[PDB]
Design a protein around this nucleic acid. Structure first.
Ligand code: ADP
Ligand code: ADP
Ligand code: ADP
Lengths: 257, 120, 257, 120
DNA sequence: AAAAAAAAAAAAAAAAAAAAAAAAAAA
DNA sequence: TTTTTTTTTTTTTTTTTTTTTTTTTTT
């Protein structure tokens, strides 16, 4: 059944090239070369997490020689209230090295060893908002000691916790800001989304004035919300038998979500 | 005594389906297939337990092989002042798995493992 | 230098189909489908572990669905003086499952739990002798508790340790034996080697009376010796600029060993 | 590339002499001769770390004699929240001596021993 | 503010092998 | 005497639980 292919494609998420993503990538390469830690702060549903993964996928571990592979970029996600011991364990596991059992100081020695062995040009701490307040001291330790550029990708609370420790604020003074979509940028993103993401047989002219206004008001510049609503209404049209999303279909979803 | 048999029936547990239950069931199957989290807000003693039980009755896990059962839905009730450890423990017990000993990080890993095995 | 690449290809490891290998794969698949335990006893340098690796390669752990992957074959190689914990831990790590902290009693149940999610009809234990008799009870607990075709790959010491327990003997009574290569069978294997593995552009005629004399004395019917000796002789002849192995070179390899 | 060599030289770290460093060195030498304990207080990113390290490189551990190397100056950087064990361990390792398994009392005795043997 | 949940550090208890050396014994 | 043969005798690596103390969090 052909319809199952459309359903399956729409169920899964994807990556859609955007100006914001390329901006972040061009910014990140400079600090990787410069070996200087940075900060990234923006709202949720802006796609910053997607751009982080997209940056990491381009740079992979190279193992031509028989020796350990060089992982230039490490991306990790600490859990809620993640402590120093747990944070070190995550880094060790990311590098395919056995995690020895012991106290926090032992884990620290193990982590420094495995980080020195590989290249590690950049270390990324994803959603540092849930990172424990005590950990920002050990993160700074690694930053100064190993010459590894460290990037913190978090929300607004990050600014709150960073300011309390004068040294941690000194370590990551500079930052890049993520924002929301608006105006012509939002409209262009919506039309480009219809051309790239949506596989519906007939274009609904979502860039038209009668429907693009609904998308503008409902998504409120959140690329995540835009993704959700577009994919959902697009899937819904097909069971009824529609080649394109209708204005009423667009209105029905936003009220529920 | 026949009278006492009727009394035992009257003092027992039973279900009378309501329009609230059917409406919620349709919406819940929608949210389940859509895989979207949501809330349900309303007054107590309005059949919340009945809705939960009648929904759970429709989807019954089947375990024809030694692999983990094909469980579509998980059902838990957090205790008063429930912490993270308790959420993890209740999810683990519901799916018929041994509760690990240790801290919240260990419980978290254990819970994700058991959740990943089944459909959930 | 092209000669360097031509030389380097020979130092490589390769598998050559043989009569004994073909027998082993069918026999083990029969025991696997039957879910019944059996034993393996052969003299050293007979490639039975190579055949076990090949049998493991034939069956590929499929991941059709999100539910735990269906690994049908388990292959663990114990060390020296292995206890219950190391055995259980190797089973756990082989299936790519986290080794948690805790007691040995909990450790024993971790492996039992991970085994059910995957098929794991046949567990194959290479170097079964190097194990503790107090671990044979755990190994046989697998055979009694679950329908698992536990296979014990071992030498003569395996027989010696197994007979000391009637229960283990009854559970692992079925077995397979190996022989050696002699006479025309050895010459056939030698020519098969020369045509399948020898990377020299010109035939060395290793089935000649003189070369067969040297090889019969040097290998004594052991396939590992044949492999090693022929690779080394080919390299020694390449160092003199030849397209094939001279007779004196083969004799020199025999003298060194 | 010549330009890349100059750029790499700029990217590297070098040590420059300042009056603040000379003042610190004189102060520390006076204290060393008097064997009087003291402290150094200042703001971050002021470079006092480098000045102390520079004092260390002034005089190294002479080992010309047949007896163990004599270390006049020990310099350590304790990690975050280091207790009364890791400190002793770091001292011992800085003196190129083995670490023995034991308790805090054992580490304490071992540390006093290695501190008495060398000048320190 | 003042009770309730969380990482280091000491301290106690128990088999299971293995080797070596000596002493006695038997034709 | 040569060898056997045992028989003691003596000397050696892994596993587990239980307090205390202390520092952060919340309420
Ligand atoms: N370029 C993109 N392509 C597809 N989906 C995207 C893109 N950017 C963002 N998203 C959507 O946004 C969500 C992730 O954003 P999020 O993790 O909240 O980033 P941040 O933490 O920076 O807000 C995903 O659900 C994803 O579908
Ligand atoms: N059929 C075969 N295919 C490939 N190599 C083989 C084969 N038979 C024997 N060998 C050789 O045996 C050597 C390793 O043998 P090994 O794995 O130790 O088996 P086993 O332990 O049974 O002796 C390898 O160097 C290999 O070249
Ligand atoms: N004497 C010095 N010469 C050159 N650079 C210095 C000096 N002192 C400090 N710095 C700069 O400061 C950094 C090291 O000083 P730092 O350890 O931060 O001092 P503190 O720890 O007291 O803040 C180096 O990156 C270096 O660039």
């Amino acid at each position: 059944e052909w319809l199952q292919a459309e359903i399956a494609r729409l169920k899964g998420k994807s990556i859609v090239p955007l100006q914001q993503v390329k901006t972040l990538h061009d910014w990140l390469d400079g600090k990787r070369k410069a070996r200087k830690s940075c900060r990234v702060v923006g709202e949720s549903r802006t796609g910053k997490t997607v751009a982080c993964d997209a940056y990491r996928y381009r740079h992979k571990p190279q193992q031509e020689a028989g020796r350990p592979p060089t992982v230039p970029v490490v991306y990790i996600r600490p859990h809620q209230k993640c402590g120093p011991k747990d944070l070190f364990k995550k880094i060790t596991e990311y590098l395919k090295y056995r995690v020895t059992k012991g106290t926090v100081s032992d884990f620290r020695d193990r982590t420094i060893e495995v980080l020195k062995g590989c290249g590690v040009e950049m270390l990324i701490i994803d959603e540092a908002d849930r990172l424990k307040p005590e950990t920002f001291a050990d993160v700074r330790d690694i930053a100064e000691d190993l010459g590894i550029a460290v990037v913190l990708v978090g929300t607004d609370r990050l600014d709150a916790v960073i300011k309390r420790d004068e040294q941690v604020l000194e370590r990551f003074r500079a930052h890049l800001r993520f924002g929301k979509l608006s105006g012509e940028d939002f409209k262009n993103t919506v039309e480009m989304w219809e051309q790239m993401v949506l596989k519906l047989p007939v274009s609904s002219n979502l860039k038209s004035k009668e429907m693009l206004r609904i998308l503008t008001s409902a998504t409120e510049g959140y690329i995540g919300r835009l993704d959700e609503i577009l994919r959902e209404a697009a899937i819904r049209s097909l069971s009824r038998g529609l080649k394109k999303i209708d204005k009423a279909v667009l209105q029905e979803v936003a009220k529920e979500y």
